[PDB]
Design a protein around this nucleic acid. Structure first.
Lengths: 46, 63, 17, 93, 14, 13
RNA sequence: CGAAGGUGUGCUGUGAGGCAUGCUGGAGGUAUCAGAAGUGCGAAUGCUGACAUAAGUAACGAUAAAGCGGGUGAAAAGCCCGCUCGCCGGAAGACCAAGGGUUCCUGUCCAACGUUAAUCGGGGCAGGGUGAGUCGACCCCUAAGGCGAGGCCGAAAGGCGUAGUCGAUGGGAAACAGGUUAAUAUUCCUGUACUUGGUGUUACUGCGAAGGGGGGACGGAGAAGGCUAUGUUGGCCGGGCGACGGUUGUCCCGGUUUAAGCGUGUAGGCUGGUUUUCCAGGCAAAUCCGGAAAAUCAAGGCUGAGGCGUGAUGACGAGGCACUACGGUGCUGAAGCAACAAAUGCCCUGCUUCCAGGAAAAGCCUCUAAGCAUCAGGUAACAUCAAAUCGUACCCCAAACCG
RNA sequence: AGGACCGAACCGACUAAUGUCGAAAAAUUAGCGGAUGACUUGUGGCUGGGGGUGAAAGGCCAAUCAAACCGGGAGAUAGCU
RNA sequence: UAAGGUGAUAUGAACCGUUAUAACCGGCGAUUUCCGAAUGGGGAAACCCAGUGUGUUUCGACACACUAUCAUUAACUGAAUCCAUAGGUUAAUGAGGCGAACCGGGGGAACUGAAACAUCUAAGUACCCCGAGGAAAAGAAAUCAACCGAGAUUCCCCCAGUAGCGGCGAGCGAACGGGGAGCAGCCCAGAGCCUGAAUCAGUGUGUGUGUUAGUGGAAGCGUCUGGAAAGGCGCGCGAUACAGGGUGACAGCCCCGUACACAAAAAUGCACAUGCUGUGAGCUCGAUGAGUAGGGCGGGACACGUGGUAUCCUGUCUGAAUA
């Protein structure tokens, strides 16, 4: 039974990585929101 | 040990820094790692001395 | 203490019409 | 020029262990800790000057710090770099 | 020489 | 904590 | 010389309540009269925690299977050692990539974890362990695609896109064998090699691009030939002749292995070479490519597995001998050939056929423009230097990845 | 030569039994279909919610689909319990 | 300031200091790795790879600095055509990103209410986007009023659930006027006479005040209970200090504080006086904002839903007078 999550570091970084968020303004707002909440992990860091 | 070396010329300041880094900083570090150093307070004292000399060099050279 | 997650359909699909 | 002071900081400490001892007595090589960057050229120059010995080649590797479970807390050790330095027929330390 | 804090009552037999 | 170096080490088949 | 709270007892009021006090408790409480309410819980398949019930019940996760002796230990069906038995053997073996992230090795401990015990463990604690010019990443080049200076468009945000710049799942220089650690090795050691650049010396010489040309450079299916990996048998070498009959014999057991590189050039495949002259073609030019003419020979050139020599009078090697913290260490070491069979692997990105007609760019070779031609630069030989940084443990059809 | 035939790997899921507080939030055992193709598969891309994609079932779009998920309008409204 | 200290979990080891450079606190300085607007190029963030210019141990190889984009300005170059322009290079200045609310502008719902629902309501609300400030916006009448008069804007209480609007349903809802907070008026569309002539902005000096370290700061004893009293008992004292906190039970008099009186080498905000720089006083004459006002068509905003609908804004087509 193949499950939904099939890990891949390259796909994870290129999809939800820090640079991916900064590319668009919506991603920048995502980072801004999580800085405000004080989350330790801003994004998925390798 | 702060104003004693304030009036020396830049040539001696570089010389004293080199021997501070050369001896009592590298040698003490090797002694501590090998366990032959019992007076560990020298390490911090030497490190602060190196900082003091560098502070003088910056306020002497250039600005 | 904590609510379950799967929450399968416990009722059996057999209508008595 | 800060090459002299740089060479005085790349070397951190010697490494003591069974592998270190057997390597020294057999291969005439010393294993020691270096700075995180510590390029092979810098290590080679530092050993030549500070220890006043002749060296043949240097091999470096990076050791990842272990994850330790101290008290109620989880911690990690710092990564460090160790270098194997192969001395020539003439050895001092 | 590392200080050892007091562990939980089901601590390892140390 | 986080390791960031999943470099490839392919031993010759 | 004992507040709140807790827990009993005795009185008291038609009631919600009140009063006194025994024991625990240990420092706060509050009369009367007024004031304000997060002011009273048994239910809402209410919310949170704790604890019952079924119940010492079902179950303990593939019906591949265990038995015994010894050891350690407080304790042994499960751990270690030994002898049997059984299971997988295109795997339930050995390797990786992805993904995990110390699970690897040693010492020590058994609380929790392990669907039982546990001295054991992928558990706890401590220490140790990952060595590269040649592997890979990095790096040079590019596909789909992403971003995108100017630019076009759009209420704003922003959309699309040129020049460019990113993007391996592809192309691009180079190492093999043996030995060694408790844990790393094509990385360490021994032996024998190879590749790309800088500098210097010597002898020649025109060098010179994002520009031109070649090359890189490519489908499906099918068949034969030559091979090798590998296997079997014979010979050779060492050992054996044997607890139930026979077995010195055409009998039994084990071994009979050796790389990269360098030299030779084969089976096979492809193509006709050489010289001269000319041409608005290759966005400019060209000795290069393409095209047109002639003379000449009939061969040349390119590619190419395997084999054969060297590598190697080296390494490895059954077995034997000497000590064992009795796990293992050291020393020594014979033969090391031939025949037959044979691949889905190599020659072969080949050849023969078919319609659905089967990437790009760089590295490399080659020709010139601008510029310089006493220079610089290039070619050939020798010497020297450099090849950084990062991954290297372990699992990887699984107890370590996704469930 | 063949969307050719038989049949492993591989892909799929026609029948039966077991299993339904399972070993498993669709599996196992015994049979079964395709297996040179309209095939299958690794890696990387593109299509985004009244939209995508669909050899078309209202199928699939992170175990959720006749309109996904998350936050907000929001203490929506509830002549009902 | 100082006789104590080397931050905490957290003990230890090795040391510093005790009359002054131990430590601690404050001002001003120095250092300030890598990522991030990230800005030399790239990139899977904390990584990879460079070019140019300055100085150096074996050529080896090192150290530092610079090198993003956009807008404006200046210089030098520079096409298709002479000139020219576009374009290119160089130097300087400014911007970039982040941040809870408040402010202005550009877009803009639905649920819900109406016991259904479409006008309407919800609501110019939620949300998205842009820009700036410490506040912002608005603001000196082509305004009201009533033929009596007030004179910028903004905010609060009335007027007032009033007049009106409205499937005249649900709902929406003013103004005039009055009472308060606070008050400030100017400049250009232009010449002349007189030219620092007031007021402003930027840089020095001086006074005062405040912030950033701090200093002094009064006065209680004996017995009883008790593990220990700050409690009970008895007798005292301080108070411009019984505000608080701590101390073995409840402390004005044990400690830190509190009222009160003082303190600044150095950096700073505020209110003044005195210098410099730059625009700029006062008088006469003239001028006095045109594709605009207004109009047709379609919408929006004013309580006002096109109604008899004034007024304002705008997409489209037209279009005056100027005292």
């Amino acid at each position: 039974m193949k499950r939904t999550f099939q890990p891949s570091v390259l796909k994870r970084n290129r999809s939800h990585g820090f640079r991916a968020r900064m590319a668009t303004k919506n991603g920048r707002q995502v980072l801004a929101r999580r800085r405000a909440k004080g989350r330790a992990r801003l994004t998925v860091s390798k | 040990m702060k104003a004693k070396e304030l009036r020396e010329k830049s040539v001696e300041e570089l010389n004293t820094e080199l021997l501070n880094l050369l001896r009592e900083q590298f040698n003490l570090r090797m002694q501590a790692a090998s366990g032959q150093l019992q007076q560990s307070h020298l390490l911090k004292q030497v490190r602060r001395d190196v900082a003091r000399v560098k502070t003088l060099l910056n306020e002497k050279a250039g600005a | 203490n904590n609510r379950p997650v799967y929450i399968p359909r416990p009722r059996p699909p057999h209508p008595r019409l | 020029m800060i090459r002299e002071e740089r060479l005085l900081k790349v070397l951190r400490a010697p490494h003591v262990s069974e592998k270190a001892s057997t390597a020294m007595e057999k291969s005439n090589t010393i294993v020691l800790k270096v700075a995180k960057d510590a390029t092979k050229a810098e290590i080679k120059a530092a050993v030549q000057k500070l220890f006043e010995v002749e060296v043949e080649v240097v091999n470096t590797l990076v050791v990842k710090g272990k994850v330790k479970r101290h008290g109620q807390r989880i911690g990690r050790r710092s990564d460090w770099k160790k270098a194997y330095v192969t001395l020539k027929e003439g050895q001092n330390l």
